[PDB]
Structure 1
Amino acid sequence: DMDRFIDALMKKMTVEEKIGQLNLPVTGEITTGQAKSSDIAAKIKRGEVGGLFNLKGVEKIRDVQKQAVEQSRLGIPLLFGMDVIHGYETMFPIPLGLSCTWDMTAIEESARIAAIEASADGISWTFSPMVDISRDPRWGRVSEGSGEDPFLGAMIAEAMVLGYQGKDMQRNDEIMACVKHFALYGAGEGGRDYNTVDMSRQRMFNEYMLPYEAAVEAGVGSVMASFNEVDGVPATANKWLMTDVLRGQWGFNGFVVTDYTGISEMIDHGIGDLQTVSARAINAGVDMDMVSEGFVSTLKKSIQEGKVSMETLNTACRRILEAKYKLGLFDNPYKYCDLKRPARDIFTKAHRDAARRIAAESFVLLKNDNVTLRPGTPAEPLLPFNPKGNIAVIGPLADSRTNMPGTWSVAAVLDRCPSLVEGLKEMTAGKANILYAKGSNLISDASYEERATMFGRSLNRDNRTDEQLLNEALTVANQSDIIIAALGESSEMSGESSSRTDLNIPDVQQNLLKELLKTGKPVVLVLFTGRPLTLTWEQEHVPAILNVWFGGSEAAYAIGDALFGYVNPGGKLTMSFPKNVGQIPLYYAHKNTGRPLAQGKWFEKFRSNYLDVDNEPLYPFGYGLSYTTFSYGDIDLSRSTIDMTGELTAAVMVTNTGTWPGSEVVQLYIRDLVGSTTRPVKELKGFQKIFLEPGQSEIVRFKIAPEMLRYYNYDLQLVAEPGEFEVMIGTNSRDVKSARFTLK
């Protein structure tokens, strides 16, 4: 059926036309790399274009599809691609923030909505999800992932692929997804984007690979090859990755696209000239060439010289044609070119309300200490509070529209998003006064601020000095009843090519924060960030800290919802927050070492520890507070022993012991006590997000079976070994209840 159709089409094709299906030039207003493609009208005519990307607007896409359908010899329709990462126009939180919902239904929903919007506007293909594991918060691209953990990363990868594609991409509101960046890109040395990656095969499989595999097994249509080398070979020329693992081991039936000029960049990597690396890429299992024109300009010559087989070419071409067929583009090239759809599907109130809900769900309450508010009274937390009197909103993130959506919002209308001040003004009209002061620049260094606010994120820095801005803010702060310090990163301090060697709140903002605290007014830190920051000073001195990541186009409203208690925060961290950059890499699923430092023993000579800080993150994986409290009973294991075909249930009663209704992410960890290789001190193996009224309890039950206990041993065999296991359940990866069982 498909096979026969594609056989017949391919029998007609010239070598040039087969090669053309593998070519993906760039166009439009959206800029995601340096090199630009020329002469696109003619190339479509010559049959030399497989797809395009970065073109926005159903009408413009329709026009281009027409040229392909009507002006090329064979009429083969184009794929239309875009980075639809965490929204099209309705922007959800950045993926890292979104991961802190621990809510696969919400995550699927966000992808569903983005697909509806993008498909309504002509897009058939998104370069998403980004599933790279990272333990290095220096790397700006942590903003695009789902944190450090592969179990949670894998579940999220599945939710995103399903949200975008549905069952089989048959509907006109379903699009093809693309798991990226295969593979290991999050382990770039120094946290410096694009830098050398190196690790053992054992680490690859146990620690980094699961999310890519989960996407493949969820039926993801395409895979993007990464910029990094693996084992000294750029991923785009690594046949072990792109054929042996991807196809041979996991059974991937789709196609592989490069990242931006990934082929020609192999010249700079230092593995040969354009022809050589182009031939190596297609022979490795790469099917589509993003921008470099390596395939289109050199593959014929390589075929003539016997460096690439006609077989290899036909396979690459076939995979591209199968993707087009599966999307329904041969049945109808204009499947996604309904000019009536943008008006009914894009940036609707329904979509924006969903984004607002998901944003509030993504926030992580890091601290909410009791503060003396009125003398004589027992100390109470600052959050939540009723919007009354004068609310100061101060800082460089307080009145920026364009920094609200987050990095990788290329189709968003940035200056349509309400700033925090605008959203809070709306939400408190008639009830409180919102008093604004800028307070500081983003950072002292003007050049830094300029590059940190590129892609239209300017904060309109002017000639007012740090001291002037501070003084104005203190005048405002001292007229107020409470201070909302809106501080942290600009959105483009994270994302692609946005690596940091220092992870503090920037200098002038931290100074501003210190001065606001010195007023004696209550201070809430509303923290904008795309990554873990080093917050030990803020943890010591600020009473309340709400990590809002970048919450999307409706962030301002969601922040209001959290501050005023309309939503009780329930986010939990998915990446460790280190005390300093000298502890990197810090991650919860670490080996014990031969000289573990016992709890509370810092400092101890001859143990694995530092002279100047303990081994712990400030906030561990899975950490997050609520306006209520939860209490855990002891773990009930249904068996003390099981065999390889058996099973048990781990159960724990969770009680809401405070005064607020709220959600709790109950987290399941397992430690394999003894291994033929060293095993992590714990691994996340399940979770359940529960909602409880005050005083209400729920018995949370986890099924545990031997398949969950498997790991890649020294010989890379995926096996569960007999022995003892420790089951841990708790409110984060640090504070847990424990019980043990034996596998026979």
Structure 2
Amino acid sequence: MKMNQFINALMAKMTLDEKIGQLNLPGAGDITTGQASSSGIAQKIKEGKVGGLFNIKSVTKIKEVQRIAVEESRLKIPLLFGMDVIHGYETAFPIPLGLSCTWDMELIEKSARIAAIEASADGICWTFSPMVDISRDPRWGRVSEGSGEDPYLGAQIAKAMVKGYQGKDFSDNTSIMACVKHFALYGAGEAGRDYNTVDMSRVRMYNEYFPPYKAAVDAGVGSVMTSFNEIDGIPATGNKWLMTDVLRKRIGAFKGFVVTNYTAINEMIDHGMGDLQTVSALALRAGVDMDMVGEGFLTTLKKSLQEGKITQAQIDAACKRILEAKYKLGLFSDPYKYCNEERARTQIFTPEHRKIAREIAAQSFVLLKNDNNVLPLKKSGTIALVGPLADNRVNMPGTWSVAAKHAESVSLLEGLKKAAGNDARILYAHGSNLDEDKSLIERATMFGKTLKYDPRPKDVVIKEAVDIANQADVIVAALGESAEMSGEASSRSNIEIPALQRELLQALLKTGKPVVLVLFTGRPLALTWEHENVPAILNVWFAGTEAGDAISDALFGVVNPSGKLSATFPRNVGQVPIYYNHKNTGRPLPEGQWFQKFRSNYLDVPNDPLYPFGYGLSFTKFTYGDLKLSSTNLKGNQTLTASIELTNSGDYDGAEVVQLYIRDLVGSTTRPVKELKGFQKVFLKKGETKTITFKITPEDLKFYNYDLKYDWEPGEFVIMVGGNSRDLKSQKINWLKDP
């Protein structure tokens, strides 16, 4: 009895309403433990009207709910239990944007593995993750959930995430089904405003935005979630071209199912697509399989079928897909597969898990500036820790951490005191609130992620910090955003550090003491003034439940920072969108020659971002020899070997991310000045040299041309290697086809 036979047999037993019921993923409402079977959701499950549920927590609650299905519904079809497990379950790793800066695919996969272990131990068998939306717009709150602006890096991370979640077998009780989102183009919302209109050409979609989604699918992701945005004037959720012709294009078949985003079907009414029945039929016809919360499928599909607006086959295909996911997950052989109390008791938020998170977090930090050897700090003397983010636990996990043990996180103050012990004195001061305008603080600290609010006049509180700082040999400024300043529906028209904090920072600098800016953020910020005036800048994103410890490992040099930016840091928001893989234009500005009239440039700011893609410093220094190519004249399907000597020429052991970029000089369409095509993170002891090697083939040269044909064209290419997208060793080559 293989899957297809079993599933066909089952569906032959089902009524029309039961098939439709499988397509329903409703909101659950409150469920009183001890009386699940008589709760609001119970009746629906009993009537076969529920295919799955989500964001229900605890194996105890889940088992009982699952028992209603197994024992009290006619066919005893078990439910899927999903959740947003985004960057950890109870143990929280850094936010995804932070994790992507590790450029370490092993660590990425590992964090996903541990998340799956924890979530599955607590009854969850399906996560709405990874989010792989490409974005070039820092205003958008959701950049925190993604992996930056690059399709290659993004695609690599997609594979790592899906593999971590899903393992080699869906039926394993430590593996959960992943869900790539949000298909598609969500990250191009106009003016960085969440949910706003998206528009772009087909050729831009294929080269610049689609690749990460495709990587997830090729990796075997089990499901796909639709996006809130329209494309070509049709909401993704109702977009047949996208959901059928692209997603399920013959060769490269996606086998899983498509679930809508939260009431995305109903929102098509607001989009302007028609009434609930109309937009529901549109969604099903497009290839949508499961309806999240809005119940458009449940309440309208029969009427449409009776009216011949949809077919039985359409309903059947969607039903079968849901049932197949359940079968693959092991639910028809054991509906309680993911419900073991002892696993939940022993495998969640363990000391070992927290240790791994701590180690992973330290490798996500990006050191953006370190003048005059300020870092690492000596573990002696006195250290002043100042800022609205110095001593707060609940913000450390950042946004999208619904299952995290927020109140058990390690504050920076806590982590610092511990690491220092009796070797160094740690002094503390609030310094300032998150921002002037209390109402902004409030909407930025939703979901219980509150900060201590100081009712005293800002000058009073600053004077307090300055006077404390004057007693220290070095100041550590913990500034930046709060957790919920990014995330969903957290768009900012201003991407600077809040004025109040900058005013505070100014006061700290004026003490004359060395200041280290420890920066908390869920997005790229505009930091020109900070870069000019602060000796050392460490971007720690949001590091998770172990933030305080991981950050202290960095500060004292237990761990040498090795992160690299996966997204461009602009000089101001007026530069947006600014990104490394751009076209040359017909009037490029020669490097270093800002400003030039009649070139492509601004009157009031240079063209360069502040920090480019791939940027990141170390406590040590890395020296690149000259790029060596095995050939500069290639023919057909040959392999080019590119190699380079890398030397740790600094004072500390450390790792660096070696990056490979390729520029296609001439094409039938304009080609980007460069695109990432490989990378390698390597650790080097002080004074050690290693040969780093990349192997290139024509596959690395391919792109989607004007007719959307994926292929490469003969001609000249530039091969580049270095420690960021700007500082590169390069060499030109000629690559020819052959008859």
TM-score range, shorter chain: over 0.9
Q: Distance in 2 between matches of 1:390 and 1:600?
A: 42
Number of the residue aligned with 1:291:
293
Counterpart among 363, 366, 369 of residue 365 in structure 2:
363
Number of the residue aligned with 1:282:
284
Number of the residue aligned with 1:35:
none
1:427 CA drift (Å):
1.6
User: For 1:708, what is the secondary structure of its paired residue?
Assistant: helix
Number of the residue aligned with 1:710:
702
1:227 CA drift (Å):
0.3
Number of the residue aligned with 2:636:
644
1:270-669 pair list within 5 angstroms: 270-370=272-372, 381-669=373-661
Q: Distance in 1 between matches of 2:694 and 2:81?
A: 43
1:618 CA drift (Å):
0.1
Q: Distance in 1 between matches of 2:172 and 2:430?
A: 47
Q: Which amino acid aligns with 1:60?
A: K
Q: Would the aligned equivalents of 2:433 and 2:454 in 1 still touch at CA under 8 Å? A: no
Q: Distance in 1 between matches of 2:454 and 2:297?
A: 48
Number of the residue aligned with 1:265:
267
Q: Which amino acid aligns with 1:68?
A: A
Number of the residue aligned with 2:675:
683
1:741 CA drift (Å):
1.4
Number of the residue aligned with 1:88:
89
Aligned: 1:146 with 2:138: no
1:691 CA drift (Å):
0.7
1:433 CA drift (Å):
2.0
User: For 1:141, what is the secondary structure of its paired residue?
Assistant: helix
Q: 1:226 to 1:653 in 2, by over 3 A?
A: same
Number of the residue aligned with 2:254:
252
Q: Distance in 1 between matches of 2:146 and 2:247?
A: 20
Q: Which whole-Å deviations, capped at 9, do the CAs of 1:478-503 have from their partners, x for residues lacking one?
A: 11111110000001000100000111
Q: Distance in 2 between matches of 1:394 and 1:542?
A: 15
Q: Which whole-Å deviations, capped at 9, do the CAs of 1:625-647 have from their partners, x for residues lacking one?
A: 00111111111110112223211
User: For 2:265, what is the secondary structure of its paired residue?
Assistant: coil
Q: Identical aligned pairs, as a percentage?
A: 69
Number of the residue aligned with 2:34:
none
Q: Distance in 2 between matches of 1:476 and 1:348?
A: 37
1:25 CA drift (Å):
1.1
- Of 167-176 and 183-192, deviating more is 167-176
Q: Distance in 1 between matches of 2:551 and 2:158?
A: 27
1:213-224 pair list within 5 angstroms: 213-224=214-225
Number of the residue aligned with 1:45:
46
Q: Which amino acid aligns with 1:129?
A: P
Q: Distance in 2 between matches of 1:7 and 1:406?
A: 45
User: For 1:263, what is the secondary structure of its paired residue?
Assistant: helix
Number of the residue aligned with 1:375:
none
User: For 2:247, what is the secondary structure of its paired residue?
Assistant: helix
Q: Distance in 2 between matches of 1:119 and 1:475?
A: 51
Q: Distance in 2 between matches of 1:656 and 1:26?
A: 54
Q: Which amino acid aligns with 2:581?
A: A
User: For 1:119, what is the secondary structure of its paired residue?
Assistant: helix
Aligned: 1:728 with 2:716: no
For structure 1, the residue ranges without an aligned partner over 5 or more in a row are 31-37, 371-380
Q: Distance in 1 between matches of 2:591 and 2:30?
A: 55
- Of 110-119 and 459-468, deviating more is 459-468
User: For 2:258, what is the secondary structure of its paired residue?
Assistant: strand
Q: Would the aligned equivalents of 1:28 and 1:55 in 2 still touch at CA under 8 Å? A: no
1:28 CA drift (Å):
6.2
Q: Distance in 1 between matches of 2:573 and 2:447?
A: 28
Q: Which whole-Å deviations, capped at 9, do the CAs of 1:684-721 have from their partners, x for residues lacking one?
A: 00011111111111111110100110000000000010
1:431 CA drift (Å):
1.7
Q: Which amino acid aligns with 2:322?
A: I
User: For 1:247, what is the secondary structure of its paired residue?
Assistant: coil
User: For 1:631, what is the secondary structure of its paired residue?
Assistant: strand
Q: Would the aligned equivalents of 1:28 and 1:56 in 2 still touch at CA under 8 Å? A: no
Q: 1:677 to 1:29 in 2, by over 3 A?
A: farther
Q: Distance in 2 between matches of 1:103 and 1:120?
A: 26
Q: Matched residue pairs, number? A: 727
Q: Would the aligned equivalents of 2:432 and 2:454 in 1 still touch at CA under 8 Å? A: no
Q: Distance in 2 between matches of 1:253 and 1:634?
A: 46
RMSD across aligned C-alpha pairs, in angstroms?
Answer: 1.0
Number of the residue aligned with 2:197:
196
1:280 CA drift (Å):
0.3
Superposition TM-score, scaled by structure 2 size: 0.98
1:465 CA drift (Å):
2.3
Q: Would the aligned equivalents of 1:632 and 1:730 in 2 still touch at CA under 8 Å? A: yes
Q: Which amino acid aligns with 1:732?
A: N
Q: Distance in 2 between matches of 1:28 and 1:471?
A: 49
User: For 1:138, what is the secondary structure of its paired residue?
Assistant: coil
Number of the residue aligned with 1:33:
none
Q: Distance in 1 between matches of 2:430 and 2:509?
A: 16
Q: Distance in 2 between matches of 1:28 and 1:61?
A: 13
Q: Would the aligned equivalents of 2:29 and 2:40 in 1 still touch at CA under 8 Å? A: no
Q: Distance in 1 between matches of 2:137 and 2:18?
A: 43
Q: Would the aligned equivalents of 1:121 and 1:342 in 2 still touch at CA under 8 Å? A: yes
1:742 CA drift (Å):
1.2
Q: Would the aligned equivalents of 1:28 and 1:54 in 2 still touch at CA under 8 Å? A: no
1:27 CA drift (Å):
2.9
Q: Distance in 2 between matches of 1:405 and 1:327?
A: 29
Number of the residue aligned with 1:173:
174
Q: Would the aligned equivalents of 2:30 and 2:40 in 1 still touch at CA under 8 Å? A: no
Q: Would the aligned equivalents of 1:29 and 1:55 in 2 still touch at CA under 8 Å? A: no
Q: Distance in 2 between matches of 1:304 and 1:507?
A: 60
Q: Distance in 2 between matches of 1:661 and 1:217?
A: 37
1:39 CA drift (Å):
3.0
Q: Distance in 2 between matches of 1:671 and 1:451?
A: 44
Q: Distance in 1 between matches of 2:460 and 2:27?
A: 45
User: For 2:337, what is the secondary structure of its paired residue?
Assistant: coil
Q: Which whole-Å deviations, capped at 9, do the CAs of 1:44-98 have from their partners, x for residues lacking one?
A: 0000001000100000000000001000000000000100000001000000000
Q: Which whole-Å deviations, capped at 9, do the CAs of 1:637-694 have from their partners, x for residues lacking one?
A: 1011222321110111111111110001000000000000000000000011111111
1:601 CA drift (Å):
1.2
Q: Which amino acid aligns with 1:339?
A: E
User: For 2:682, what is the secondary structure of its paired residue?
Assistant: strand
Q: Which amino acid aligns with 1:57?
A: S
Q: Which amino acid aligns with 1:484?
A: V
1:418 CA drift (Å):
1.6
Number of the residue aligned with 1:239:
240
1:468 CA drift (Å):
2.0
Superposition TM-score, scaled by structure 1 size: 0.97
Q: Distance in 2 between matches of 1:126 and 1:606?
A: 51
Q: Which amino acid aligns with 1:398?
A: A
Q: Which amino acid aligns with 2:547?
A: A
- Of 413-422 and 565-574, deviating more is 413-422
Q: Distance in 2 between matches of 1:140 and 1:127?
A: 18
1:343 CA drift (Å):
1.6
Q: Which amino acid aligns with 1:261?
A: T
Q: Distance in 2 between matches of 1:319 and 1:409?
A: 29
User: For 2:540, what is the secondary structure of its paired residue?
Assistant: strand
Q: Which amino acid aligns with 1:137?
A: P
User: For 1:649, what is the secondary structure of its paired residue?
Assistant: strand
Q: Which amino acid aligns with 1:227?
A: F
Q: Which whole-Å deviations, capped at 9, do the CAs of 1:111-134 have from their partners, x for residues lacking one?
A: 000000000000000000000000
Q: Would the aligned equivalents of 1:477 and 1:483 in 2 still touch at CA under 8 Å? A: yes
Q: Distance in 2 between matches of 1:314 and 1:39?
A: 28
1:600 CA drift (Å):
1.1
